[PDB]
Amino acid sequence: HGEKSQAAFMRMRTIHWYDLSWSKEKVKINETVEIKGKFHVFEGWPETVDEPDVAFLNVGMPGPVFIRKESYIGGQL
Amino acid sequence: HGEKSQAAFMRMRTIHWYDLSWSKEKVKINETVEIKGKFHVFEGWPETVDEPDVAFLNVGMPGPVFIRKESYIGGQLVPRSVRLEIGKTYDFRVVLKARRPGDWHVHTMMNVQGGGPIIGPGKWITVEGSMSEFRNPVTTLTGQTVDLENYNEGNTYFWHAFWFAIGVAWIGYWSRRPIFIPRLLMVDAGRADELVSATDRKVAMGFLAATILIVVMAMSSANSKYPITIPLQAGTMRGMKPLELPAPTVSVKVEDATYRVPGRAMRMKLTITNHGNSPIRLGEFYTASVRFLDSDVYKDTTGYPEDLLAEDGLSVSDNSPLAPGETRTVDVTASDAAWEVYRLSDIIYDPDSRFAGLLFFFDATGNRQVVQIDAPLIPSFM
Amino acid sequence: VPRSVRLEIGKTYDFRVVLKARRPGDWHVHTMMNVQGGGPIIGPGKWITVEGSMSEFRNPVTTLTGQTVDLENYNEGNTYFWHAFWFAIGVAWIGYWSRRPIFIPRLLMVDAGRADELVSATDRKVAMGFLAATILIVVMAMSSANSKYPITI
Amino acid sequence: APLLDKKWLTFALAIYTVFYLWVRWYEGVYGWSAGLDSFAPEFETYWMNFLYTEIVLEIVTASILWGYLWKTRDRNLAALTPREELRRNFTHLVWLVAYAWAIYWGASYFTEQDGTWHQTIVRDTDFTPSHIIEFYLSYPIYIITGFAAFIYAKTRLPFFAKGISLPYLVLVVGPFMILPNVGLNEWGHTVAPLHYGFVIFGWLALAVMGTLTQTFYSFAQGGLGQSLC
Amino acid sequence: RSHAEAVQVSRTIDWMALFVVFFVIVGSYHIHAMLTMGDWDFWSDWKDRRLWVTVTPIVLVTFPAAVQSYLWERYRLPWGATVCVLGLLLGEWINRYFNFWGWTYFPINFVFPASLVPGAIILDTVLMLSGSYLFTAIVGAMGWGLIFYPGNWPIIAPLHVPVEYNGMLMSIADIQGYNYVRTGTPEYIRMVEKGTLRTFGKDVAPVSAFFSAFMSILIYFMWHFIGRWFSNERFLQS
Amino acid sequence: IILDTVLMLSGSYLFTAIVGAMGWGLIFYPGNWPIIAPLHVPVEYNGMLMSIADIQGYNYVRTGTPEYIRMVEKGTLRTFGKDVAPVSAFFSAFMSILIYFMWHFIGRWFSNERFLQS
Ligand SMILES: [Cu+2]
Ligand SMILES: [Cu+2]
Ligand SMILES: [Cu+2]
Ligand SMILES: [Cu+2]
Ligand SMILES: [Cu+2]
């Protein structure tokens, strides 16, 4: 809910998410869902966006409707 | 026309233009000249110049005496800025079209965000004909063919003249009545109401309404006449292809770099080691736009500028064929008047007295290897 | 490396520092790397004992002009001479006006409207002479310094 | 004798226009032929000689004009016939016209002619033909005209001789400080801040709004006022 | 001294004073505008939707505000902003036809300046009709900032036509700037819209304009007080 | 002494703020050159070209100030070789004409004599 209004070139030439997999589509109030996958930082990065030298793996949700128990990039938390 | 006054260390240690070739030296008012070649962004880039992260392949000419039809860095068209990498050789090709008749000094140049201009060698090109014969046609995606020299010249004149006439009429309406001095006298006298009448208010309201209506109607008409428009395209291209040059089989170590400064000459001592399987001879030394040649080893056929070409400038004490696997130390002297003319001696005035350059080694069969020299430069006064 | 340097995050480099001893005592010497955005990075330190007298220290260098100079006493007479000369000129300029009555009756006469009687033509002539002499001395000193040291970088 | 002396206004307009047109023609013909290379002998022959001669001539003309204007100061100003005061006010307004025209030619035409030169050459030398004509020719010309107008106002008009007019002093001083700015222009080169000094001191020209007002009041002091009812 | 001919003396003085005001305004306004926003006016490569409409109207309230204050307060002359706009346009056009095209031979349709008259008459009418400097400083400044881009669009629209140049999508203004080589200004100096991850596609041209309008409401007001300072008449004694 | 003489002879704070400040900015480097010239002698130290002042700073180790803190001339692609020393001086002169003037008014504020009652 916020990507339909971003520059359709930024969206194309920033990161290339793929091989994604969501464990479940119906959890309960104390259950966990795992979102695995891989991303490719494009080589022709836009120039009005600074390089991913300070990035953060966030989750896009309508407020704390879920809590990030753990987030790993490469095996490390 | 602007390189003779740049720091002779910046000029030496920024970019190393080579293998350049200018197609013609006499074009006509609608003909094209191609400036091909290769550049090597030096690894020891100056530190008061930002890295070539935002660069641009420009052409150095006295105003639009030629138009850049196309400019390519690596095979791809670069109509925008570019990101280059400190240490790589790239290939470049500029196709220009001639506008004005005369003898012009055209130079390739690289503009860098943090340092400014880096000017390469320049060549004299003669253009014959008449400027009125120049035409620049393009074909738009909408299906219209337009000449860029006279396109949108009537519209701009029309609208600017219309707005200027409106402003002049607005001023002249009030200029028909008495102006500054009795107006000031009546204002100071407390008669601030008698100067403005209801007719003036009505005229002002009409002017404001007409201005707003005219602007809106003109915008609507322009939108209708040109329904398909795109925003202004600006960006920096990151993925430029560098040249994958084989690793040189020659190694040169500089032991002493000395230049006299009542002088036109430069001296270095080089320890040269050959790792290739062919005998090798040093044929050329490249410094900041100046090529010092040796007539025995290598001759020039590309047509380099006369003022920058030293046919016999390079003198090597022991320029015998260097056997494979052998190391030897030689004294190399590069002497030409271009050292004085192009103010490479003013390195005496520079805060960083280090020099960089390219050596070219030619084997017996004709193969050529490029080696880089980077060393401090020492003046000799006695 | 008599200047700054660019290092790469992740590489091993080799370093060698040759120092010459000046002062006698037991000193804690450490190698260190100074970085533009972080400041000092101090390595291990070692205790070194220096024996002798400080007056025996000599630092000779040989310039490209052909002169051999000791850096500890080089250009010590010239700096003292010029700074003392300029200080003496300034002191004389102040003392010229300090020979006459100073702040308080001057303020009383200024408040009384007598702003012209305080400055005479002799003071104007002295000031003009001082200005002309200062400019001439500066120009002549610069010319003499250029002649004495024609080769500078 | 007519109240306004037409020949002097015509002379001022004509001399300024003719001299600046000749300078533009010289630039158009020789700047392309010799002014492109700053190390060529033709550059010294046609442009540096121009700079030296122009500097000496400007100093001589400024000194002579200021000296002649000061040496003819009206020693007694109470014995002036009001008609003579009106004539002197007209002459001062002609001086203001000349100063305005010089300001136009200096800060509006050649300053942008020089913007034109920079998007056609690579570097900003201290003595490009545009700088020779703009920094050292036109700016001193309008500075000389402004200072001469101020001196004329002080030593020949009864209203302006009663003190130093703050708007007039600002109008003749600020526009001048743009000249000293050059140093920062060069120090910066060696829409950008390196140029915000010309902006600041260009504003002080707006001080004309004050000065002109004083001028009008002088015209009203004689008798024009009551007659204009 | 006069005899019912004062009328003539007035008329004459008026003409000379009009000349002086007009040309001093020309010089000062032109040097200021060129020295602040000159690079956007110089080239059609810089007439974009983000920074052109942001910078140009914000910078150009400075002299109209002061001249409007002086000419309204003392003479009830409402042409304060229009004369500044006309003088700036005249200076830019004279230099462009005689130096950009006459000297360096850049084409006219490539170096044309921006149009400012409709907003100037808007501001002058707003000040005259309401007679309030605060109502003007708000409403007229906002309108001045808003009307800038619609006023220039009829001149700019034919240059923004899509084209495929050597395989890459460009506009006609971009091709003009690319073909006609300016050795002084590379492409990267262009302070034009480049797009961001927070920029909304079709909302750049309006929003920026509105920003300009708001800033005008500030700058005008400030410069109004500056216009009340240069309009002094004090005689310092030293 | 240049500034003081300029103020006394003309008796004008504006003429001083222009001419004397410009002269003050211009005379700074010629005044120091006789002291500085012998330190700017070329030398070849361990194969690299240096000045005597540079060797002094390199030899005499200051743990607090590394070399990179030195706000010294380093050269640019827009810098003209022999025109750095004069132009910079002129820049200084111009800025003096500003700062002096401003501080003059500050000098007129600290010279007050008011007695606040709280
Ligand atoms: Cu969503
Ligand atoms: Cu990818
Ligand atoms: Cu050239
Ligand atoms: Cu290289
Ligand atoms: Cu310039």
UniProtKB/Swiss-Prot annotation, chain B:
<dbReference type="InterPro" id="IPR023301">
    <property type="entry name" value="NH3_CH4_mOase_suB_N"/>
</dbReference>
<feature type="binding site">
    <location>
        <position position="107"/>
    </location>
    <ligand>
        <name>Cu cation 1</name>
    </ligand>
</feature>
<feature type="binding site">
    <location>
        <position position="105"/>
    </location>
    <ligand>
        <name>Cu cation 3</name>
    </ligand>
</feature>
<keyword id="KW-0812">Transmembrane</keyword>
<feature type="binding site">
    <location>
        <position position="1"/>
    </location>
    <ligand>
        <name>Cu cation 1</name>
    </ligand>
</feature>
<feature type="transmembrane region" description="Helical">
    <location>
        <begin position="154"/>
        <end position="174"/>
    </location>
</feature>
<dbReference type="Pfam" id="PF04744">
    <property type="entry name" value="Monooxygenase_B"/>
</dbReference>
<keyword id="KW-1133">Transmembrane helix</keyword>
<keyword id="KW-0732">Signal</keyword>
<keyword id="KW-0520">NAD</keyword>
<dbReference type="GO" id="GO:0016020">
    <property type="term" value="C:membrane"/>
</dbReference>
<feature type="binding site">
    <location>
        <position position="40"/>
    </location>
    <ligand>
        <name>Cu cation 2</name>
    </ligand>
</feature>
<feature type="region of interest" description="Cupredoxin domain used to construct soluble pmoB (spmoB)">
    <location>
        <begin position="233"/>
        <end position="382"/>
    </location>
</feature>
<dbReference type="InterPro" id="IPR006833">
    <property type="entry name" value="NH3_CH4_mOase_B"/>
</dbReference>
<keyword id="KW-0186">Copper</keyword>
<keyword id="KW-0472">Membrane</keyword>
<comment type="function">
    <text>Methane monooxygenase is responsible for the initial oxygenation of methane to methanol in methanotrophs. At least in vitro, specific quinols can replace NADH as reductants.</text>
</comment>
<keyword id="KW-0560">Oxidoreductase</keyword>
<feature type="binding site">
    <location>
        <position position="16"/>
    </location>
    <ligand>
        <name>Cu cation 2</name>
    </ligand>
</feature>
<feature type="transmembrane region" description="Helical">
    <location>
        <begin position="203"/>
        <end position="223"/>
    </location>
</feature>
<feature type="region of interest" description="Cupredoxin domain used to construct soluble pmoB (spmoB)">
    <location>
        <begin position="1"/>
        <end position="140"/>
    </location>
</feature>
<comment type="subunit">
    <text>M.capsulatus has two forms of methane monooxygenase, a soluble (sMMO) and a membrane-bound (particulate) type (pMMO). The particulate type is a nonamer composed of three alpha:beta:gamma heterotrimeric protomers assembled into a cylindrical structure; the beta and gamma subunits comprise the bulk of the membrane-spanning regions and the soluble regions are derived primarily from alpha subunits which form two antiparallel beta-barrel-like structures each.</text>
</comment>
Curated annotation (Swiss-Prot), chain E:
<dbReference type="Pfam" id="PF02461">
    <property type="entry name" value="AMO"/>
</dbReference>
<keyword id="KW-0812">Transmembrane</keyword>
<dbReference type="InterPro" id="IPR003393">
    <property type="entry name" value="NH3_CH4_mOase_A"/>
</dbReference>
<keyword id="KW-0503">Monooxygenase</keyword>
<comment type="function">
    <text>Non-catalytic subunit of the methane monooxygenase that is responsible for the initial oxygenation of methane to methanol in methanotrophs. At least in vitro, specific quinols can replace NADH as reductants.</text>
</comment>
<feature type="transmembrane region" description="Helical">
    <location>
        <begin position="137"/>
        <end position="157"/>
    </location>
</feature>
<feature type="transmembrane region" description="Helical">
    <location>
        <begin position="207"/>
        <end position="227"/>
    </location>
</feature>
<dbReference type="GO" id="GO:0004497">
    <property type="term" value="F:monooxygenase activity"/>
</dbReference>
<feature type="transmembrane region" description="Helical">
    <location>
        <begin position="78"/>
        <end position="98"/>
    </location>
</feature>
<keyword id="KW-1133">Transmembrane helix</keyword>
<dbReference type="InterPro" id="IPR037001">
    <property type="entry name" value="NH3/CH4_mOase_suA_sf"/>
</dbReference>
<keyword id="KW-0472">Membrane</keyword>
<protein>
    <recommendedName>
        <fullName>Particulate methane monooxygenase beta subunit</fullName>
        <ecNumber>1.14.18.3</ecNumber>
    </recommendedName>
</protein>
<feature type="transmembrane region" description="Helical">
    <location>
        <begin position="103"/>
        <end position="123"/>
    </location>
</feature>
<dbReference type="GO" id="GO:0016020">
    <property type="term" value="C:membrane"/>
</dbReference>
<feature type="transmembrane region" description="Helical">
    <location>
        <begin position="51"/>
        <end position="71"/>
    </location>
</feature>
<keyword id="KW-0560">Oxidoreductase</keyword>
<comment type="subunit">
    <text>M.capsulatus has two forms of methane monooxygenase, a soluble (sMMO) and a membrane-bound (particulate) type (pMMO). The particulate type is a nonamer composed of three alpha:beta:gamma heterotrimeric protomers assembled into a cylindrical structure; the beta and gamma subunits comprise the bulk of the membrane-spanning regions and the soluble regions are derived primarily from alpha subunits which form two antiparallel beta-barrel-like structures each.</text>
</comment>
<feature type="transmembrane region" description="Helical">
    <location>
        <begin position="15"/>
        <end position="35"/>
    </location>
</feature>
